[PDB]
Design a binder for these strands. Structure first.
Length: 162
RNA sequence: AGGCAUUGAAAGCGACCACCAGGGGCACAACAA
């Protein structure tokens, strides 16, 4: 929380930074609807960021000619393919067998889709101006900021659930 | 030894898998005259 209050402090007069800090929390607060590694098991950064690392690696690797509205479908496909390679306990929407499979699938596909839509629309399209150089220089600062955002959301959940 | 007759239908793949982890700075120099 200390290092978040510093980011929230340096951003106070600048909209483009305040927007990026709000977006970086929202971006993970969206993927935390469908993927949750438990911090108690002492996980890697690779784990905490699995959907963000596969959203960015797909946006950056695909040819620069292709549209945002196709990038979202191929990236949500890869996220769906990647989630099916993890162990089941990390997937909040599938893991509750209390609800029917065809609706667990519908909630997973829309939770992945809305996240992939935020990464391609708001991260790449809006904030990074649709430029792969500007996203490639930010890649690692986004990943660090998202790791702190994931820990802040997890701390906030484990407190406010009382 | 003769005439004859050197083939013929069909099939031309089928299933699944298209990755996995972990790293994402490390050291120092911020003025000199």
């Amino acid at each position: 929380t200390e290092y978040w209050q510093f980011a929230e402090l340096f951003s106070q007069g600048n909209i483009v930074m305040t927007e990026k800090l709000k977006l970086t929390k929202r971006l993970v607060e969206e993927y935390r609807r469908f993927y949750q590694v438990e911090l108690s098991k002492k996980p890697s950064t690779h784990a905490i960021l699995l959907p963000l690392s596969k959203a960015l690696e797909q946006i950056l690797s695909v040819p620069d000619d292709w549209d945002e509205e196709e990038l979202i479908l191929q990236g949500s496909g890869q996220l769906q393919a990647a989630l099916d390679r993890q162990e089941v306990y990390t997937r909040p929407i599938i893991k509750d067998k209390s609800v029917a499979y065809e609706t667990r699938q519908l909630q997973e596909l829309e939770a992945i889709q809305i996240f992939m839509t935020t990464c391609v629309r708001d991260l790449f399209g809006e904030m990074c101006k649709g430029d792969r150089a500007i996203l490639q220089e930010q890649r690692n600062r986004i990943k660090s900021g998202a790791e702190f955002a994931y820990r802040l959301l997890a701390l906030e959940a484990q407190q406010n659930q009382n």
